[PDB]
Amino acid sequence: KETRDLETLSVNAIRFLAIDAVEKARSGHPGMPMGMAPLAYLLFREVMRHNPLDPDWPDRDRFVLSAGHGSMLLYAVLHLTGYDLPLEELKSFRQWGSKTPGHPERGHTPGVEVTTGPLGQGISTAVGLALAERKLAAEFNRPGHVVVDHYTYVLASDGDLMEGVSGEAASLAGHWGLSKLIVFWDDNRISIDGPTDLAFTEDVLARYRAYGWQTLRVEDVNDLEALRKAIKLAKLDERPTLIAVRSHIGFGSPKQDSAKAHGEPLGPEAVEATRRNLGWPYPPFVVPEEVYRHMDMREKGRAWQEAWEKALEAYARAYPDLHQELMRRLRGELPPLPEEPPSFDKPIATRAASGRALNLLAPRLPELLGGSADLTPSNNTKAEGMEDFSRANPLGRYLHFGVREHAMGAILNGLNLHGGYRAYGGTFLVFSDYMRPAIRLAALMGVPTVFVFTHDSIALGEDGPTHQPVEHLMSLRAMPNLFVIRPADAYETFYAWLVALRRKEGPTALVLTRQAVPLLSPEKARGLLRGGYVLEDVEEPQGVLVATGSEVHLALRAQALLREKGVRVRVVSLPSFELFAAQPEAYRKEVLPPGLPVVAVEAGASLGWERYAHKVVALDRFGASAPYPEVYERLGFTPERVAEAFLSLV
Amino acid sequence: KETRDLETLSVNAIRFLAIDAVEKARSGHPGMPMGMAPLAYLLFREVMRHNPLDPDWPDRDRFVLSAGHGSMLLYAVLHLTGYDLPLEELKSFRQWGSKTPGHPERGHTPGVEVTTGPLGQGISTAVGLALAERKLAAEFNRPGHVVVDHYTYVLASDGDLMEGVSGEAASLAGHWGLSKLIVFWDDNRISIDGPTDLAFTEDVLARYRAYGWQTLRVEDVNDLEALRKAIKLAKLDERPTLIAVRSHIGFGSPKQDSAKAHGEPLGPEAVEATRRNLGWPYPPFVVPEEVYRHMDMREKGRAWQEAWEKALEAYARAYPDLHQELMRRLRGELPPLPEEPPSFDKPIATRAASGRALNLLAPRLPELLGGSADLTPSNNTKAEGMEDFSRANPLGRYLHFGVREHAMGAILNGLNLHGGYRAYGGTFLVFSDYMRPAIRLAALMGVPTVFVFTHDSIALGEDGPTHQPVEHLMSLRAMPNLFVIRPADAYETFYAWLVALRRKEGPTALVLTRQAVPLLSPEKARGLLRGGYVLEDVEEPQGVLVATGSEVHLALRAQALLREKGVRVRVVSLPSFELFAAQPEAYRKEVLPPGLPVVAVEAGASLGWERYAHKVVALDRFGASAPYPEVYERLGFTPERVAEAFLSLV
């Protein structure tokens, strides 16, 4: 009973820290933390190896709160187990500048592994984390030197499992046989709209079994022995595991089993009743020293990490080259990058130039993983020397995501979050729309995921308007902390990859053609490193043609038509708006002189071009199913129209 | 033996029209049409009730080609059955201005029900087609008067079934019990990357059974009796059915069961080898009169439609008032609508004003269907008078989509395509990212879906940066054929709903606040009908503050702030860029006088504002977890910052 009592006291400490933090904030989600407190207790106190003094310990188990609304469950248990998350931060839940935002933010709170809140993201990203652990173990573990060994745990809600992305990621995790991915589903039969049976009556565990997962059930979350057994059963199984855990949202309160418990403070009445019902004599934010002593993980964390560091030292002696490579990759340190582009001797699509740059870069980047959402021969993402990842071949650095852009985005993010890898994946730019929430989450977390987008324009031709981007470029450019690089040619494409790989602050979208475009000079194209540059200057510029990607070549042909009529314009290549705006004002003004009329050319929406141009040759309608170059010309992309647009300003 | 010959002959005419059209285009996808010809034969010749003479017959069975790449399968069979699709259009497959674009485009080809090509869209949109038939049948059918009675057939590929949207949509179709939805999956074990077992080994039919679908197997697509069998089994069942149909991609060619058959022309050798293996003597685009006569559905089509026309007249006699409402709704005519807004007395969020507008509008609009992706209490999308749709209550006009924005998008499109309904659904503006391809597919098709998006800015407060839109407004405004209306207040919100309901050309996004904002004059707010208007003029304006939604109120505060220092600016409300752009230039230049310095104010990305403004008070970073008004103020939306930005111009 004193074991039981201390378990029950510690669990209620989790419940009441969450209840009282929501109440003081008058904002947040007390209901799921109230139900799931026992699981958070069990993971952080007994099951997981982790170090509250070093949240970045590379061999820690990873916990993902996919059900991010339940943030106070995680803050309470970080606080109680000795992470640097003081009580004062729990009393500033949801307040400006606090380490306790409404939804978990990786980088803002120690021990937060993934930014969650958008449902389906945590559970999907966790497939990446587990795939990262599996592949790094395969790469580095040696007989008697187990240097990579950790689990990926997830707490997911009904919402997570309704989102298509979680089903895409689950199909892949099962295909991949990721045995160390263990997901707990809070089966509490309640969602925001009320009872789940308004919208959600599928056989969830039957679906997960169809994906090749193990399913287990725990009939009462409050029964710690039933949770321990299910977890031990999960660790013996070669399949990823979903454990259905029945709970009562708002457990112990008069809002128990109600959607009203989901998303608003309990109120003083229901807080007083929960106190009485659960036998909690402690006032707000007071937890007795007994629980803190019981929950302190600082000493077990120190000992776990020290045992790992001692295992690393024996590794460094038995295998110094492996050890040095592991430490370099775990630190996120790139090796020296080539400064010389590949050799091009004829026109080539920027997708193929991209495949050529990867052939150069991959052999010198063992951390570099590639893939495609079933567009491998269309995206040029499988570098020479890369082989397919599979259960049978855990060392392959190439991932077949299938027709799953969204889960591809989430898995790339998890691969990039874990440490050890740098991952890119490919699809068509139009199908960036299938993965937007994963692109935004990489931007929010500052995760340098590289998104490769081919078939960037109407120039892709016959596949027609459902495949032809229009709004895509400006829709991505508007997103904070996303570089969008649209190389004009094979040479720009090489510099675009160096920019993307060296950018650690957030994601990069690489935007590439299907159709072949001419070469530029390798010396001129290095200007991509400044985001925008003068490609072809003239004496006493009367104006500027500014262009991106494929349209730079249209711009150069228009520069010749104007030069034949005695009008002198320079051509600026603007491969990246973001990298150009980061340049000194003096540089930006040298490139685009104040007072000179400017025409922009880009086969995409015009909205945003007024930032740089007085007139734009752009596409503000959907495309057409026709061959290139006819479709391009008849939708207005001719050098005669760029010229005419320039002559209208002078 | 001679029936059999005419079936084999008609099936091969479908294969060779597909092969030869792809060959002449030198572009497209011969492989899936080759395998699936038997199915196309059977649907269009025997199973389906359709009229080639009238593709708009409202009681026709609907066929959705979800696997849009296989467009020539549909084009061949529409041609063969006597649809208005001449041989000359097949000869112009994927050519400029042709009626045979590379992917099916609704309104460009007679008998094409949905624009497809983005995988997952057709199978998902089909759920809305089936939901509309089911509800219209419940609303209008009377004893001895079946005026609504038709099936929704889908052809889907592996790629459709890996896409998470198809899982979301299948979960809802099984929950809803949509028995007359019948999906055929081309189980050919090939995708673009090679064998499906590179990335796709789940038990698909076990997953579909977990959704509450019937699942059937046809071991050989060429066995027409097995197909007839499965379809009869589907029509007897009270569940949506998935029929796994095994086929060889590139059936009868040297490229059979190869990814090479997927997406390029067979080439001359493989064409010649296919004519031999299948014993097809006829040169390209030649089909024997024998087949045209067997496949001609014009007589049976007219007979089916006249029978329905007869039953409608009999309905008009028995049920004059129902018949009138049905015909009005089938034609998409609005009944008269209230002309004055709800009466408001206090500060109110535009989400609550939207709820008040729907309470006024819905009772006049029996066609109007509402919904939310599990945010019903947050989005104010359940009008007073609406009840939940469910299998037991097929008459409810309110749809609980659960946490499925993407399938909600597609289902709304299905409902709005079918005829008889106008459908809207709500989520938070940030979660438009989860449904973007269905938003784009509404804009491509010109389907007037109304997307309700609340929680439009950092002003939503504590839920933090994962919930707070930044890029979303401009990301949506860049998209062709989408109105984005961001009403300033309760009164603008009523006119926004009128604008959306009356716009039939394409979709409308209504963008609404979480937080209360003040009321404007009822009469002033009518200016929303012109997209942009002068809200508060002054004498001899020295400049303009232009603003949208909530920031209109910040702009009036900044106007008053500037007047207290002798500076006179007008305030323009720009609730819609697209409706303002559509006004005469003379109006636009009355609203924004050339020469006058313009400061814009919007709590979203700056990119795009240069089209209207010289300086923009905007947000180009992710938000923060803190209460409103503090979060809005500390991120730089103050009257002092707006005045400061105008004084840095004047």
Ligand SMILES: Cc1ncc(C[n+]2csc(CCOP(=O)(O)OP(=O)(O)O)c2C)c(N)n1
């Ligand atoms: C993609 C996405 N759509 C919508 C929401 C809004 N939202 C937050 S919590 C939630 C669902 C709550 O139900 P459940 O996930 O079962 O949570 P519980 O209250 O049972 O923990 C919703 C719809 C979201 N967070 N993410």
Ligand SMILES: Cc1ncc(C[n+]2csc(CCOP(=O)(O)OP(=O)(O)O)c2C)c(N)n1
């Ligand atoms: C959402 C989406 N992502 C990617 C594509 C590109 N694409 C077109 S067809 C296809 C898959 C082809 O495999 P499958 O669907 O099995 O077709 P099959 O060759 O068997 O007809 C792909 C990835 C697409 N059309 N839509």
Ligand SMILES: [Ca+2]
């Ligand atoms: Ca729940």
Ligand SMILES: [Ca+2]
């Ligand atoms: Ca296939």
